[model samples]
Target: FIGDSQVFIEKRSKDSKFVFSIVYNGFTLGVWVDVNQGLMYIDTAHDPSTKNVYTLTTDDLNENMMLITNYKNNYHLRKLASAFMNGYLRFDNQVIRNIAYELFRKMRIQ
Candidate 1:
């Protein structure tokens, strides 16, 4: 976590898809993280005279291309989601998934 302009930015370089920008209204964490693609990266300027540039590995992306970005998107998200659902299903909390699914279904019906 890093802070500037009194706003704290929390980033997990591993195991998270989102980076949160937290603000304190004098005190306490307010608002959840606004999500961005894990592959989206920023390169900060080491020298004050140079402008910072953001970087990603989106283009020229083939099975052969090496990872230049902080994270991999499609492959990583699918792998992670698969692992999460495996654990989440093992919990077998169908009542919870059902309730949420029904809520979204209701929204679609409307």
Candidate 2:
């Protein structure tokens, strides 16, 4: 985990929402769950030359069996930061799934 990072849960009814955020250098990367929508959200930022923000929503946590299947699934969160650091991943809707696939593969140790 990053030194200045933070994570917490916000409970609602029978479900709970999770929030994860990390501050590195001058950038911030985060992930959270939407208990109501049954989805997960990822936020990443830091530079076009200095600062860019990317918000991504996952494909249904319940159906995808994300967290339940494996703990490393959370590594998608890590990959977001990696992509930003490597300076190639773009903040574009068209490549959402491609970006996600790259992350997913890493989670699978591929």
Candidate 3:
């Protein structure tokens, strides 16, 4: 298990869907899996201006993509992959939010 985490739901007026934002260490990693969207992704900011983008569909979560990012360590990526695979074992809202929090803690950002 990835333990516990917290997430905030921002209401989207246009789609009437809740947007989930992963919050950690006063820094937020946006573009997380929506409550309704089963897709999983991880976005890492390399700097103030650039970001490392990783994404996976429902079928491809178990597969690995061959792409390089500024962050050399793939541990976080692997954690996210595992999260995607086992996340839905429980409530989507709770699991996803906790996964996001777990990844954020692993990140150790300031």
Candidate 4:
């Protein structure tokens, strides 16, 4: 699963939007995946047009389910961030899922 969504308050922007740019490192894979998926969302409610979704899975793991993130437009991204920070929403975003899957796969092979 790959989700390219970022909630950030830019220096000149009044509100935070779904930024595809690299805000941090160690999330290179996540960032690339998100970018390739094209435009992602910030939230679902604000941007009902976004249907992009992703899931984290493993071929060897039974009932494999990990972090997943629904890419939304800027509007929803902010809402999502708010929900995530408030604990109202559970962030199972693809970014962490990718990392987890990579680690899990490596461990499985060993």
Candidate 1, 43-110: lDDT as tens digits: 21133332322232223353224544344343532443354345321121344334434333432532
User: What is the lDDT, from 0 to 100, of the residue 13 in candidate 2?
Assistant: 30
Candidate 4 lDDT, tens digit per residue, 1-110?
Answer: 66745543212222333333221123222211123322233222223232442333443553233333333333643543464456433223545544534543543543
For candidate 2, the 10 contiguous residues with the lowest summed lDDT are 7-16
Candidate 3's displacement at residue 42, Å, is: 10
C-alpha lDDT score of every prediction, in listed order: 0.29, 0.43, 0.41, 0.34
Give all candidate RMSDs, comma-separated.
17.4, 17.6, 13.6, 15.2
lDDT of 2: 0.43
True lDDT of residue 39, candidate 4: 29
Global Cα lDDT for candidate 4: 0.34
Q: How far in Å is the alpha carbon of 51 misplaced in model 2?
A: 21
The residue pairs found clashing in candidate 4 are: 41-71, 41-72, 41-73, 42-72, 42-73, 42-76, 42-77, 43-76, 43-77, 68-92
Q: Please identify which of the two predictions, 1 or 3, would achieve the higher lDDT against the true structure.
A: 3
Off by over 4 Å in 3: 1-10, 15-52, 55-67, 71-94
Evaluation by TM-score, superior candidate among 2 and 3: 2
Model number with the top TM-score: 2
TM-score for each model: 0.19, 0.28, 0.25, 0.21
Best by lDDT: 2
List the candidate numbers ranked by TM-score, top first.
2, 3, 4, 1
